Amino acid sequence: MLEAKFEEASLFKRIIDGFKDCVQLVNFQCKEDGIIAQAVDDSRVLLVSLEIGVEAFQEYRCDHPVTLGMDLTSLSKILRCGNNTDTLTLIADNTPDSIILLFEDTKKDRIAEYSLKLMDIDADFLKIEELQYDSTLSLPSSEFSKIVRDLSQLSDSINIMITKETIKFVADGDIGSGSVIIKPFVDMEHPETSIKLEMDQPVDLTFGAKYLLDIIKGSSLSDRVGIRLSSEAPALFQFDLKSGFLQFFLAPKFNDEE
Amino acid sequence: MLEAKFEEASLFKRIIDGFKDCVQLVNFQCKEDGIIAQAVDDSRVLLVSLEIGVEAFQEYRCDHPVTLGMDLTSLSKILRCGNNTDTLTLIADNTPDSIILLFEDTKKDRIAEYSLKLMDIDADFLKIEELQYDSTLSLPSSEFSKIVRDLSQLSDSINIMITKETIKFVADGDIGSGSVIIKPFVDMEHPETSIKLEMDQPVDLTFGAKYLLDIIKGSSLSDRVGIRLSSEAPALFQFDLKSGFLQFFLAPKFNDEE
Amino acid sequence: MLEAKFEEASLFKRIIDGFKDCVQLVNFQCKEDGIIAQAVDDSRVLLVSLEIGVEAFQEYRCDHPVTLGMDLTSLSKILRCGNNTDTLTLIADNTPDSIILLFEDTKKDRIAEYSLKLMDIDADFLKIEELQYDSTLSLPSSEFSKIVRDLSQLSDSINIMITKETIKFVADGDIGSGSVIIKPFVDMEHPETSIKLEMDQPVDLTFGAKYLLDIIKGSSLSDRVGIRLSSEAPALFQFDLKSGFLQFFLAPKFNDEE
């Protein structure tokens, strides 16, 4: 069973836009403590992991863990109906064939009620995140977006190099090249702008501009993105929600991978 | 002869945008009491009927019913010059080859004067609207636009079902389906939001999302669209003007038609 | 050597957008009194001539005339990083292979430093502007833009006819035709709106709508464009800068040329 309704349909429409783009399907599933989901591009280098806590729903009941996959573009079309304030109510029975998305106006005039035929995925969820990542930084999300779009002009691969007290994005391509370089610092004038960074061992990872571009669409969800990198493992970029989060595990380039 | 000038060129540029899109040509023609026009798509299921009363012109003289057809996209290009406030003056002689559209600034500096070569249509105007339509409703135009765009995401055909005190748009397609359902109601707090509906006999008509999408572009002309449906006849959607109107007669789907 | 930094990176990003579009390459070069540049489309009828005085830089040193060519689209990509306020510093050594464009935030956090591989052009600068042009006019730039976009709807060639106290743009095409006509006049209420025009001999020149469309993108640089026409010579359209300018020499149509 499943019955969950958000206050503002925007929140759910915001989140889904965050990965609607980098993955073809998403296998959603509700647990007693909230909703979670996961997706992997066909290119098999990008993993999307989502969690919306109960804390984010005005009503929520998942009395029996219903797993349900579905095409994202199809889900986005149904979410276009959005109304970003008028109540969105996910509804899905015990063993569903389609999830019913129900929007209702502030009164009872509009019964916008869509049903989206679910997909069929042979659920193989992955737990690849790890305990210790070589380096860990965070920074204003939009600062990060700029850097990622910018450098992706020059090259198809952005290189993220982290050394002691120095974070350096560098794109080197054909027309030329360029590199943004930032340093950790505080700002109690609005601490959520200060660049936090710990580095257990300096790291140098190169990723695909393509994918990174997708990963920054989660910026419309948080004030600060957090990036953790590991030499022997996909880097974990994350954006926090009011209860829950949205994380993208991107596999660093071998020479391919991106 | 013909000499008609609107106060704000916007009004005429607004109207023409309303059907510029769903028809290839329009056969314009002036009568002593105003200007009227009609168009039918090549697909032969959509009829556009327009009427701009004298009441809407600052000057108007049609001393001898000049019928003049013309391509819409071509007319739209000439209307792009629009200036939405600066005086547009339609001018066309007794037996014209082209209509002269003249814009002049608030003084005499700008003589924007275009001439558009008329087309040649063997005028066969149609009077297909009828006395009694099975059901009749009206509603905020934008409410209607939403419903039409929305449902057209799911399907290529929107179905409009009208029963006692229940108006229900339903699109059922491949990714899934969905239906908006509204009920008649008043609102003296701004009566032009209240949903008026009379139903002599309940009706169930299915149309083409494609066409309906075009029909809602007339929303930029009125606060409320009016829809009248008939079992044995094209549905009449209309948008009222300050003297005159703009109506689209769309032929309900057999299985084809849209 | 070369080291020049603008206060607001916008100014340089504004200028380059002005011709980024109508030319493939630009051969930049610094002289003791400022920076200048020139470009010619492959179509060989449009010349772009630029000059940014020292007066427009917060710092400037060109101790040895370094000529450097470069692709514009590539330059525009690097200028997208723009930040329109944060300091852009052009840097190029004595005999460069690439120009380094350096943006820095208001503090020292962001070292956006790009390098653009220069091109290789066998510099043949042209001095084709002349002493006396048959007619000379100026007018609000945006007034001019309108006229140029408008008429380019009807035709592929705009004709500029200048007679005593009458400036008349006329496009005559297939769907029809149209002509804007203006007259010289003063306005001490904001003199920079008054249409200045001297005519030593009346002129009638026809140009390519295509090119003229490009020439008006320099409007985002000045309040008034200035057009000087000559029977036996490319017309000179210009936009003035705070020290310097931007001029486009367009070759009038023979029947071809545009």
UniProtKB/Swiss-Prot annotation, chains A, B, C:
Its main location: nucleus. This is Proliferating cell nuclear antigen. HAMAP family: DNApol_clamp_arch (MF_00317). GO terms for cellular component: chromosome, telomeric region; nucleus; PCNA complex; replication fork. This protein is an auxiliary protein of DNA polymerase delta and is involved in the control of eukaryotic DNA replication by increasing the polymerase's processibility during elongation of the leading strand. Involved in DNA repair. The gene is POL30. GO terms for molecular function: DNA binding; DNA polymerase processivity factor activity; identical protein binding. Residues 61-80 bind DNA. The keyword DNA-binding applies. Keywords: DNA damage, DNA repair, DNA replication, DNA-binding, Isopeptide bond, Nucleus, Ubl conjugation. Sumoylated on Lys-164, and to a lesser extent on Lys-127 by the UBC9/SIZ1 complex during S-phase; which impairs ubiquitination and function in DNA repair. GO terms for biological process: error-free translesion synthesis; establishment of mitotic sister chromatid cohesion; lagging strand elongation; leading strand elongation; maintenance of DNA trinucleotide repeats; meiotic mismatch repair; mismatch repair; mitotic cell cycle. Belongs to the PCNA family. Homotrimer. Interacts with RAD30. Interacts with MCM10. Interacts with UBP10. There is a cross-link at K127, K164 (Glycyl lysine isopeptide (Lys-Gly) (interchain with G-Cter in SUMO)). It comes from the Eukaryota. PANTHER family: PROLIFERATING CELL NUCLEAR ANTIGEN. It is found in: Nucleus. There is a cross-link at K164 (Glycyl lysine isopeptide (Lys-Gly) (interchain with G-Cter in ubiquitin)).
